[PDB]
Symmetry: C2
Subunit: 632 residues, 2 copies
């Protein structure tokens, strides 16, 4: 490592990034140019195997500003990952390996980023996950760093403060956060909207804080060496010039999110000693130096595999990598009336007992969400994570637990506060990771806490979000079947659970929870079908019994999962959905009109009152539902 | 003010709160008891008129921990607001004036609170609103304080850090935040999940920080006097004992959210010199002292009205209180092809020119959202607010602008980042305030930024949320008509706007935007009706022309607002919805099955690519839509 080679390496990264953006006529060149010197130096510190991006003890690199994707892709290509020069030439084009923000389908990308702040919380999560991995497997086997590059947008977002709060509490001395302090945001100078003492902020949260010139190779290297020895999470505040190297665009907010322009790039190449009339150029010295990551990484992983072979942890690691979901004996809730928060809590305990990598927690609502994993201890030594009142960071942290390699995480809160974590849930869905969301207190059945605490629209949100299963079990048996599906599924799942006691169901007549909806009651020449989920199924059973006593044949359908029902074939749906179909849910769920002629829901916000009073107010009684079905 | 009277006053508040919770068998007594000494002293500082809760220059009191509602209600009753002893006896009961968390329908409640963190951001917003009011009306007329009581849950939430960041930047020396530091959260000791240096955190954000014993009347009074003279926003860290006065429950996390119990209350009353066998008791000295707020408040408001009469601001204040929406000449966009972000930006400028209280901003996306109010300056002197990368705090701050008394605020971001602010949007909806949400970049038409930046499920969320209008205009004319409705409406509205250019529509055939959906094309004996919103309307017009050329009569319906369409009578809906109805939207909008037989939408996440390539990929072409409609 020396100034001449580092300058060539940094400029190679700058011009690959600039050329990529220019060819796409789209993207973000300013930050890549501002960060290129830092990444060049960081390449000498990062421990990774480009030919095995799943090596468990690799350093984890996170670009929280996913807009700087061109720089990440340049680095992955140069380092020997499975990303070609042609792929770089396809930046931002339909179906390419180089989308505008990074996606985990591109090998080498640790986690999908883009929405600001997320990546900082994800990096904290990788650092917590690594501490838990060290607890399970030993410091001989888990000893790596977590490097996160972030910008002003990330640090203004509330989620960054939440996650960094937890990083200081948990003494995450494996976490190195590099802040690109370039004085610019979209609306112009950062001072228009931000003037915090950033050093003091992070020291208040238990970080060590270093401040450098992000274009001085010696200062970057010295900061990284110091950060690696820190006994605290470490922040490097790196002062940079946005679009560094790009002449008239240096320092310009306009360089953030639009191509630099052909003439600017020609001039920049000229000033750097590069031929201005060629694009996507990789000079020899830089080519060889960056690609030596291949040989170095193979040797690092080989040494690590030798430690694993000597360890007493081999069988444990194999169990963590190969969980057996089939063996699990779940509780038998047949015939047992219970609130589904309580059946679910018992299931969480069975899962934690059977699966060494299953863990999670609540955003300060454990006693209400019923998520305590009894006698399994507190993080880091145990399994129960105390996220605090930090729903959003909790979900982003657990997205990283799910990506780490050995964990099956769950995030818990009240269903109304799913809205605080929805942007991170969406990243789980985008990536199709195995991360389970536990949402209790699902309806106006909450009662006295009132309309701020009574979900209405959240079921619609989760059902509309792609790549999610939204389970709303009517009893414990459905709750178990939902978990069996969720563990085998290729996408994340939410569990929407009651505060209040529900009535145990009788056994399925036709179909089961695996079909999303199934028959609880089937009548020849049914005139009506009552379709419900969760707490409304019993109302429909009772109403169907009354309708039958009045001379109307009825089907009753339980629909624990709308998304699974949508996948069933027409023959199956047609067997269930007979006559006039009435959907019944304590929610404003207009999506039910996909399957129902009429929907009996809630169109307003709720009310503060006793649960039974609130349900009556909103029409959830046999007499009212039967009157509605009989249109009079 | 002396120790004997203050102790009696504080204990009066404690036992009203405890008795209320006990009678309801529901609620949160611990914080009321912990905060009662602070509120007793604060009652001597607060400037307010119990008989006119709308007095513009009143101090604004915000309980961010809405769970402490019993204490607020006790104080409002004692101070002479329109809240009776009987109302206190109806705490948490259906349809009472004393719901479990505070609602603005209870006179004296400044803003609805409950979801943690919100109230802190709302209080920052009242302080910013007051600074703008001072800019408009003068320091002779606007000089009041904003007091916020908060707890651990509030300060762990990201939104608190975001809002307090802005408070320090804007030198909000009218803002006094009182933090109830009681060492407890729901999961037990606060140290399980939080160990920040809170003084350092707030000093990093430009606050003055005082630290007191929250049970020492002299220290509370001295802190308040110092805070009132601060040249910075001020934090008082008040160390308290949860359930102070309640013997065996002192310091217990169990006192947070359940009744204290009859025996605990008897003992607490005995120790305080109160008769344990009576409930809802107000001793004479305390009764008289608390109710003197009536006479004092009338005199304070009278003095203020005399200043208003001497001011040169009388006509301005009257215009702000009585905006004339009818007079406004909006731009004429007839026949003009435009992106609806651009028509909307022109409308925002016309509104800001015509309405002295209309203002707002973006979360660091002004240039992309097209929200700059040209030549109207930056806050505080002007109208453009630079919220930074703080979507959630922006919305909570603007909820407070909307409650202040003289402002019409708008919050702007990309539609995908509506998810960061949704919990605060929900409070706007709950309160039915006039707060406008501007969401640009509404679909896969975003293009190259890819699936993290392409909305799919957000339209469903906003349509499902009660008390919101969700406008998705297809052209500038619809955009204007939507604003005319939104300004006259009794609920908040969102505007869902395109990045990309849309085609101007021809004039309505039957109905208009006021009906939510209306006919653009009507054919006798229509076989198909194509229903769309926003950017998909033109596709449907073109597809209907092709279907007509192939011998199929078609209606085409534009649906700029689903919620308004839901309110139309059956005769109107039946005229529009002829034959087989196909809904077409670049969204996963299953709610369209309320009106449509078939829905042609998007069921997956998007793709990074050029807009035209992405729309083709997802099926938005005439040939594909016609093939779908012809079922082959």
């Amino acid at each position: 490592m020396n100034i001449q080679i580092l300058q060539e390496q940094a400029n190679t990264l700058r011009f690959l990034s600039a050329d990529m953006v220019q060819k796409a006529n789209s993207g973000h060149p300013g930050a890549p140019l501002g960060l290129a010197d830092i990444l060049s130096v960081l390449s000498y510190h990062l421990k990774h195997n480009p030919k095995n991006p799943t090596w468990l003890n690799r350093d984890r690199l996170v670009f929280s500003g996913g807009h700087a994707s061109a720089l990440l892709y340049s680095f992955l290509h140069l380092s020997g990952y499975d990303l070609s020069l042609e792929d770089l030439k396809n930046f931002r084009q339909l179906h390419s390996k180089t989308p505008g923000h990074p996606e985990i389908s591109t090998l080498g990308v640790e986690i999908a980023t883009g929405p600001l702040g997320q990546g900082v919380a994800n990096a904290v999560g990788f650092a917590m996950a690594a501490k838990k991995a060290q607890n399970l497997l030993g410091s001989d086997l888990i000893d790596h760093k977590i490097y996160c590059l972030c910008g002003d947008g990330d640090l203004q977002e509330g989620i960054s403060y939440e996650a960094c709060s937890l990083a200081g509490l948990h003494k995450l001395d494996n976490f190195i956060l590099i802040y690109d302090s370039n004085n610019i945001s979209i609306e112009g100078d950062v001072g228009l909207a931000f003037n915090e003492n950033v050093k003091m902020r992070f020291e208040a949260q238990g970080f060590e804080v270093l401040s450098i010139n992000g274009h001085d190779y010696e200062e970057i290297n010295k900061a990284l060496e110091q950060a690696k020895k820190s006994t605290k999470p470490c922040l490097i505040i790196a002062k940079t010039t946005i679009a560094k190297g790009a002449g008239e665009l240096e320092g310009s907010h306009k360089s953030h999110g639009a191509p630099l322009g052909e003439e600017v790039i020609k001039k920049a190449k000229e000033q750097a000693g590069f031929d201005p009339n060629i694009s996507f150029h990789i000079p020899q010295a830089s080519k060889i130096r960056f690609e030596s990551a291949v040989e170095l990484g193979d040797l690092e992983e080989a040494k690590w595999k030798d430690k694993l072979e000597k360890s007493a942890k081999k069988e444990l690691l194999e169990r963590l990598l190969n969980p057996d979901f089939n063996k699990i004996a779940y509780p038998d809730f047949k015939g047992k009336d219970l609130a589904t928060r309580d059946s679910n809590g018992e299931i969480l305990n069975v899962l934690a007992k059977n699966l060494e990598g299953f863990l999670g927690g609540s955003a300060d609502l454990g006693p209400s969400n019923k998520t305590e994993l009894h006698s399994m201890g507190d993080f880091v030594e145990g399994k129960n994570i105390h996220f605090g009142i930090r729903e959003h960071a909790m979900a982003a942290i657990n997205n990283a637990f799910a990506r780490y390699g050995i964990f099956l995480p769950f995030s818990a809160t009240f269903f109304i506060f799913s809205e605080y974590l929805k942007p991170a849930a969406r990243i789980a869905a985008l990536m199709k990771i195995k991360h389970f969301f536990i949402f209790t207190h699902d309806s106006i059945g909450v009662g006295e806490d009132g309309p701020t605490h009574q979900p209405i629209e959240q079921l619609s949100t989760f059902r509309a979000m792609p790549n999610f299963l939204t389970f709303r079990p009517a009893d414990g048996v459905e709750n178990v079947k939902a978990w069996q599906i969720a563990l085998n599924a290729d996408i994340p799942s939410a569990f929407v659970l009651s505060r209040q006691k529900l009535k145990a169901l009788n056994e399925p007549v036709f179909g089961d929870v695996k079909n999303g909806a199934y028959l609880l009651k089937e009548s020849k020449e049914a005139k009506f079908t009552l379709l419900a989920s969760g707490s409304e199924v019993w109302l429909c059973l009772e109403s169907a019994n009354e309708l039958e006593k009045q001379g109307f044949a009825c089907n009753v359908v339980s629909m624990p999962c709308f998304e699974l029902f949508e996948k069933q074939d027409k023959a199956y749906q047609e067997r269930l959905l007979k006559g006039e179909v009435i959907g019944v849910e304590a929610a404003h769920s207009n999506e039910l009109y996909k399957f129902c002629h009429k929907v009996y829901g809630i169109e307003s916000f709720g009310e503060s009152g006793k649960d039974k009073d609130v349900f009556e107010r909103f029409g959830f009684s046999v007499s009212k539902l039967v009157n509605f079905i009989l249109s009079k």
